[PDB]
């Protein structure tokens, strides 16, 4: 209901409501176009996550998943940071992360008229370039002489009725500072996933580095900690039910302007196929041995705008709705095939991201120095392919067999990827085809890969079954996109017309746009809920809950001996709740989605109160229409984070830098 | 902690505490030795259950399980009362139940000195007759000229330190008045068993009949409704958290005076074997395809009495404790074999209660009229054997195989029942032995039994495999009892000595005796609890909870169309809670156990507020030491009972008789 993800510019038209909920911040304290504000502290981590700066030395807080790749890359047999955690006791002990990028919003500019004028310049348009962030960002040099360490991001808002430009400081020297052990960072990661109550210490600590002047730069020996314009201060006094909660971050995608028919499609195609493919997964895992509906809500909002379009002489609103419905039915087959490919293969079967040999392998194999460069690319691709964070569940060969068999049944042979339809044809079934791949591929195992990398050959790399699988699957993805574009372009144009009417009716200052992975703020209150009859969920969880879930045999519920020793002695310090319990997590009515992972949660005074890392609902259903009655965002208590650093890790250096207030 | 099951005579020494909890009743209103009180309204149903009289025409309320046998006996294909429920719209439509007995306490008398003097009369005693209720009840005619329709019950209290006599009016014309459908009477009977929250309408309605003068009698055409001295009035104003709750009934067995070593034995033998055998059951069901410990608490109480025995010159207390421990270890093997036979075969394998041919079958088969009499006994035994209420779960042949196989592994051949050790020896395994029985037995199926009963033969009945099984299993039971008696008698004597010391220390007026299936009262408050971190259970459940658990495919969760129609229209009447929700169940901190099934739950003013039908904990662990912090008794809301009669059934006759106050 009230889950708006507001633009930073809309702080003025929201500040009144927020102060009545208990906020003591001023509008300029949250966003200031002429000074420092909380904007300069909320960063984009690795492009898909969110982080917060908490010191004058550029200390960065985020989730455990967002920094997983970095923790994994730095992990070994002797020093398993992924399992045991990592704690640097000095600036020099902080681990360098090649490739890792963190962006800070320097300033935001309205370029609506500029972008629109640039779109008219196109001779014969595809019809989707007015929404493509890649195309829109290329129009930036003509608008702004582009400095280094700066990126100019331009994206569509309100379905293409507005265009805002984001000037980004791009830091390319982001180093790993700290990380909790896996038993804490993802306690009950499988069972309690997308679920409240929760008892997970989901965090990881990084730091921004720059030159002597504080400007973004590549890794250098001489680089020093970045000193931000503004960092969020950490509060350790605690939280209470009913408290105001401010969340800033980069929400990925929402669908708040969905026509009733768009909800039907999402339910019948997008959502059903997601649940169907996910069901096969937990079936493969299972062969272990020892009052108002969504469509009704969006239909009411649809009719509300249509009744406003009528009564006023506007016909376009009503033309847009039917134009949308027309495109929906037209792409029914295309959308269905895209979703099965996306839910069944691209996600679910890791083989889709198998390494591909570059031109240096096929060509120039005889050039020794160039050969090793191509082999290095292969090795690099394999490490970023083999075992990701949360996604490896069970036996990969059996999982791929079950998913591909279902895919082959849902999609006819002539509409399958070439590798799949040819493989099934030659080996008989989708099972036998997968079996062959895991039988012959280099990348089927680490020991297989390393055994091959000790005497490589060009042929073998070029004709690898798993590589051909990933390429042909990707090729189909892009064939579908080009073909469904004949329906998506009329859909997009009609959507722009429909949102334009909603904009005319409700006014832009009072209408939050859909999330598009740009900086936004949202607010609510710390509050529990009633999941079912007789049962009430509180807003806060404690360390006692961790001990209740302790199962020495269930690896997701393993409790570290040190953590258990702290619980027995009640050695919590000033981090504990007033009632003497040690806080772990809390939930809030604030709307967050994919991309808000690692978002700072702040006080009524704008002090860091926790880190967002999950929500109690899964699927995108809550992004179509938020339901604050039961839908919550699950947040790591910042006192628990401090507790892990202090009483568990013994890394006093980080406490002294953070300086938690009380 | 405070789960005393007080004698009716102890009402004086408890009334003060109860009134401070909010009770407005006087002591004489609960128990009066010279007048009518709530005592005369709380009846013993079928010997093992409890019932309450709620009208001047002898209307009786109890659970759905307590009257199951009656509902089943009266059920047929055309009129399935077990599934669809039963509702009599007049006195003449009430169904006669042969054999059903209901006892009312006429008066209670202290006969301690009399019984003890009678025990000294025994020449050479076994050592257990001072606890045997059968023996003690035979001493009654010498104490009291015994009228008809009266039974004199004498039992041991405080381990044989007190003896109280109960004069019982025995009604043998108890007729079935009403019963809810199975979908209501046992909604979620499997999953929500021994569990809170709960949404079960567990009840059944009977009525006492008597002669023209109101005296107990066998069934007769001329019998009229019994008019009790005192009946409990039904209150429909509702309940609130914190309200005083009085429960009267007949609790079966508790073990509050257990020595620390007695707790160890119970845990290692009694409880472990119960859980072990129960585990095999849910394993057979699973091959469906598509801060202080108990011993520590009782040790503290043990030492508390021992420290009191010392300091005072008493040595017997300390002699008793070691005497108990001596008997415990002595019967270790005997107790273990008794428990495996009890948990593995007597309960779990229904074959243990297979029909046995009487002397009229073996002898006098040539006498035609006597032959049919024996066949009638066989038929009677089969109906009371074949499919009980809550116990038939799944395939019986596979269940017996799994349990007997485990039994055979735990108990060596020479210590097994003769039928089992000889069957296993001839057929090879416990599986093949069970297979033979279900292959050849008459009683293996209803259709098998009826097919046999159309042309019976003497041999076949006499040598039936299932009959021989039940007899030899029973024979072993009685061989074990006679043999373990050499340890149980010194144990009993030592227990009597130990409780005697506790009696001397705490005083009888302030000490509640262990339950022995006699009339007792207990009290507490209506109150929820915290099962785990972040989760809170309320004290009351609503009809909304039923609809949330609705699963048309899960038979235990089938919701009747009529009940669902009532929920949609909110047709609750004055039965609904103040907030507009329809109450179903509530829980209280009152200690109840097996035998309290159907016990009346009453107001602070002694008005019927609900019926007890379960508790949120299983096993006997709470009967050794009650833990009111989380242990609750689960109670049917009386307003829900009235609602089922009125708005669901349409049996207005019962409402007009009950006359619910407000
Ligand atoms: Ca607090
Ligand atoms: Ca009420
Ligand atoms: Cl293509
Ligand atoms: Cl705690
Ligand atoms: Cl015997
Ligand atoms: Cl309700």
Numbering used by the authors:
A (entry chain A), B (entry chain A): 21 to 164, 169 to 314, 346 to 717
In the authors' words:
Here, we show that dipeptidyl peptidase 11 (DPP11), a central metabolic enzyme in these bacteria, undergoes a conformational change upon peptide binding to distinguish substrates from end products. As previously reported, the overall fold of DPP11 comprises a bilobal architecture. The upper helical domain dictates the specificity of the enzyme and caps the catalytic domain, which has a typical chymotrypsin double β-barrel fold. The active site of DPP11 lays in a wide cleft running through the middle of the protein between the catalytic and helical domains, which contributes to the formation of the substrate binding subsites.
Interestingly, we obtained an unbound PeDPP11 crystal form, called here PeDPP11altconf, which lacks electron density for helix α14, indicating its susceptibility to unfold. Similar to PeDPP11 complexes, this structure is also closed (rotation angle of 27° of helical domain relative to the catalytic domain), illustrating the enzyme flexibility. The helical domain displays a high diversity of structural states across all solved structures in this work.
